[PDB]
Ligand binder design. Structure first.
Ligand SMILES: *[C@@H]1O[C@H](CO)[C@@H](O)[C@H](O)[C@H]1NC(C)=O
Ligand SMILES: *[C@@H]1O[C@H](CO)[C@@H](O)[C@H](O)[C@H]1NC(C)=O
Ligand SMILES: *[C@@H]1O[C@H](CO)[C@@H](O)[C@H](O)[C@H]1NC(C)=O
Ligand SMILES: *[C@@H]1O[C@H](CO)[C@@H](O)[C@H](O)[C@H]1NC(C)=O
Lengths: 532, 532
């Protein structure tokens, strides 16, 4: 039976699902780890004990326990990102969409969801892999991993809550794919991991980490890179936050054992309820429990790994969206609202940059302000708003990614860079937010091919072209069709540093993506903060 | 006799001089101080002892002892600035051009020459006052003052070489004008002092200094302001340079008395020959002997005087040229030559900014570099050249002047700001230098009205219009004709900060002259250098 697959962990039974007036198979909720519950909370995951009988994989698994956005109740713009399944600590499962008839050995793509390491689900509608599996004939996998304290509480030295367990969850799922995807018709030698934001940073982290490098072939990073300022913390900061989490729950803080034991008796929601109280600064785009530079998963600091070429050498395709910061200003900066144009006064601008670069002294705050202020028209509310939008985007996503790509390209086997700047015609978020963080995903997953969703014809064409770039790159290491007649997405090189825009207009090649601003964020400001 | 004038110092005999096919009187070489020779060198000037008989004022006086530019022998571009008279320490004289017939009580304008405080002459061809006196019917005076060590050697505490004596020379000449210009038909109650560069900074210094404020009515500053980085030094730095001058001449350095006595036995050329060896840094646009913040001529630091309104409150008219820095890069920055386009490589750019901001640490040098580098086209030789040109101009002239004007305007009775950007059609200097430092002077003095000089008709029209702005401002405190039909030069206000361009095209009003760059030079960099 096409819906029955025998894996090394036991038999699995899928379900036939319709897609663009055809059908493919879907194996949903396949367990790849023992449930990380009870005394296993904060612990490294354990391999799923094989099972007898047939595992029913016809429905989506639970979503991991996570903070839930309630800023705009009933608003689809924000709720499409929330868990659409019951939450549970028993959440380590993966989903596979397989073309029909079942391929013998085709390209595999494993999606790693984003969500700032504190949220995210593999079951969201924008992550439905059927359109991509079907349209590009690839075996599409979406994995899951613990987020929040459950996935990243870090007390270095302790083996009970070592930190990074959420990354190890991803690695185990990549191990299961490496070990079993052949039975679903996928080529374990041709798997591409791809993800957005924290998912994009995770992808980069698996490229860096010696222990994950052999489990995949190529990588795609969307609006995230491993060296992002919000993507990791030192073991000292991780410890300080775990202890502070404990203090918020009236825990005994005499020892890691006492703290860990106390945290394990608390119900999930108790940890989620005080999660945000541990941040060291009043900030925006900073999350409580994220990966820690532990000396294990990451042998040394990310920067020295990038400088010495200590990472997997392969091809990568990555990029960013035009207005990466608007989401975070809307949720946490004074003066921004969902229903107004959000014109920003100098006062709110100043408050905004303080929130955006939490770790900066006054001189640093001044350098940023000068760098983004048009002093010939300083009280212009639109410029202040857009300037703040660029500051958050540049500091948090674009410049860190540009630094990663420039360092990677020196040792890699091929880099393709994009700049996604098409605002979807049916976006429910206000205009001022522009091309929002996370809104290229719907084009990568092919939603614009679904008539009922209301995208234009050019938006379907764009989605088809992006899906074909991603899948062709996954298969060959190059997003371009060998002897095609379409315009070529040029390779990014250390010298020419080319990139393309990704929108409904005719391809246009550019160079040095935001260099002016990134020299400021990557070279000048850090030097300024270190000296002062 | 129209050429005979009886002053409080004695009788003077002028000479009739032709001008644009007419004639006016000229009284040249009138002494206003005792010759500052012998034991008087470095000393405050003394009032000229009255003389019996008639002083022959038909020819130009000697020029003060000064370094002489020999960079381009025979080249008029540079030699027009050199002394065109025999040099001598006996050089304190003034020149007066009087309309004919002799006015009874007209507007007086006193010109103060520039030359970085180390050079300059009242007798240069570009300073010929006959065209302005004749065309605008004003009594035009040009004074002189000691430069170099002779005018500014400073050993604070000593009364033998107190420093600032060159400024006191100017003040004495302004005193003589106040006391005697009535006899030449000038109104001592309506004198405007105006000057360029060091002359412009001197004008501003007389506005600040309590002891000079009552000697004039209004002021005009061209490409110079009192707070310029090269226009003054602390008493400590002045002392350090005087001592170092002494060391270069094998002087006894045990006491000020020993040093001063030794320096007084040396011939003029001996001091001039080692003058440049005392600068503390390898620099450009820095001069050895300049005014010192002594607590006397300047009661307190210039900045606190500007902040508290401690200065003469009146009307001022001032401005800058488009390419103030090219002169100094040509003479001292590697990669610039008179006969080539002077395209600059990154290496020479980096050497240039180091030379341009001598007092900056590495972080400061980086902030400047980032601020003026187009990182999208960093190896562009023209951009590097023009960028260096702007750095020198902004740091040394424009931003210091913009800081002065903004501080002055808060307490003054009227400010008129200009931006002179017309490159003369007959300029002998290369094109890359643009609108050079000091080349608006020829338009202020009316040379374009002299056919043989070869200016276009529009250049004559521009010169006529500038002369009429300067003279009308001198007479009334406003460069505009009351009920004229011509476009109005708007007042510069704290709020709107308006200014005009000065060129052959129709007047065009602008706002916030180079704010972006001046916020960097006036607010950010100083803060950065103080913090680091
Ligand atoms: C698989 O389990 C789900 C759980 O609700 C159920 O809806 C579905 O009918 C089951 N299918 C089979 C064949 O057991
Ligand atoms: C990738 O590696 C192959 C073989 O090592 C080499 O032939 C090719 O030039 C490389 N491509 C790039 C873009 O580095
Ligand atoms: C004034 O003195 C100068 C000095 O050379 C001389 O040329 C001129 O003829 C003299 N005129 C009179 C009237 O003495
Ligand atoms: C200058 O002062 C006069 C009298 O004090 C006043 O009437 C006038 O408004 C002032 N002008 C400016 C521009 O400050």
């Amino acid at each position: 039976s096409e819906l029955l697959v025998n894996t090394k962990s036991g038999k699995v039974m899928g379900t036939r699902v319709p897609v663009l007036s055809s059908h493919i198979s879907a194996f949903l909720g396949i367990p790849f780890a023992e449930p990380p519950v009870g005394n296993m909370r904060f612990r490294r995951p354990e391999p799923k004990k094989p099972w007898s009988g047939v595992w029913n994989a016809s429905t989506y698994p639970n979503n991991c326990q996570q903070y839930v956005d309630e800023q705009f109740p009933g608003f689809s713009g924000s709720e499409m990102w929330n868990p659409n399944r019951e939450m549970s600590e028993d959440c380590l499962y993966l989903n596979i969409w397989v073309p029909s008839p079942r391929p013998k050995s085709t390209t595999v793509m494993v999606w790693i969801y984003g969500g700032g390491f504190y949220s995210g689900s593999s079951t969201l509608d924008v992550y439905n892999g059927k359109y991509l599996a079907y349209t590009e004939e690839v075996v599409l996998v979406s994995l899951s991993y613990r987020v929040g304290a459950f996935g990243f509480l870090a007390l270095h030295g302790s083996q009970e809550a070592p930190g990074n367990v959420g990354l190890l969850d991803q690695r185990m799922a990549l191990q299961w794919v490496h070990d079993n995807i052949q039975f679903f018709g996928g080529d374990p030698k041709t798997v591409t991991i791809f993800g957005e934001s924290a998912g994009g940073a995770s992808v980069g982290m698996h490229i860096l980490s010696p222990g994950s490098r052999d489990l995949f072939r190529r990588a795609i990073l969307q609006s995230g890179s491993p060296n992002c300022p919000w993507a990791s913390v030192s073991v000292a900061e991780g410890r300080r936050r775990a202890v502070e989490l404990g203090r918020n729950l009236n825990c005994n803080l005499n020892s890691d054992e006492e703290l860990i034991h106390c945290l394990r008796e608390k119900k999930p929601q108790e940890l989620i309820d005080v999660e945000w109280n541990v941040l060291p600064f009043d900030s925006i785009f900073r999350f409580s429990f994220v990966p820690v530079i532990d000396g294990e998963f990451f042998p040394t600091s990310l920067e020295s790994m990038l400088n010495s070429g200590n990472f997997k050498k392969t091809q990568i395709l990555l990029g960013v969206n035009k207005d990466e910061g608007s989401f975070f200003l809307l949720y946490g900066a004074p003066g921004f609202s969902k229903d107004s144009e959000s014109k920003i006064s100098r006062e709110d601008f100043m408050s905004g940059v303080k929130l955006s670069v939490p770790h900066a002294n006054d001189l640093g705050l001044d350098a940023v302000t000068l760098q983004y202020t048009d002093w010939m028209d300083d009280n212009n509310g639109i410029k202040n708003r857009d300037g703040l939008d660029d500051i958050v985007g540049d500091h948090n996503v674009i410049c860190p990614l540009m630094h990663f790509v420039n360092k990677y390209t020196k040792f890699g086997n091929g880099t393709y860079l994009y700049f996604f700047n098409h605002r979807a015609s049916n976006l429910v978020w206000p205009e001022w937010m522009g091309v929002i963080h996370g809104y290229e995903i719907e084009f990568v997953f092919g939603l614009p091919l679904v008539k009922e969703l209301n995208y234009t014809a050019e938006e379907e064409a764009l989605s088809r072209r992006i899906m074909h770039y991603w899948a062709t790159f996954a298969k060959t290491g190059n997003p371009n069709e060998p002897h095609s007649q379409e315009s070529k997405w040029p390779l990014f090189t250390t010298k020419e540093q080319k990139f393309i825009d990704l929108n409904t207009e005719p391809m246009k090649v550019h160079q040095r993506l935001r260099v002016q601003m990134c020299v400021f964020w990557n070279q000048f400001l850090p030097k300024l903060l270190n000296a002062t």
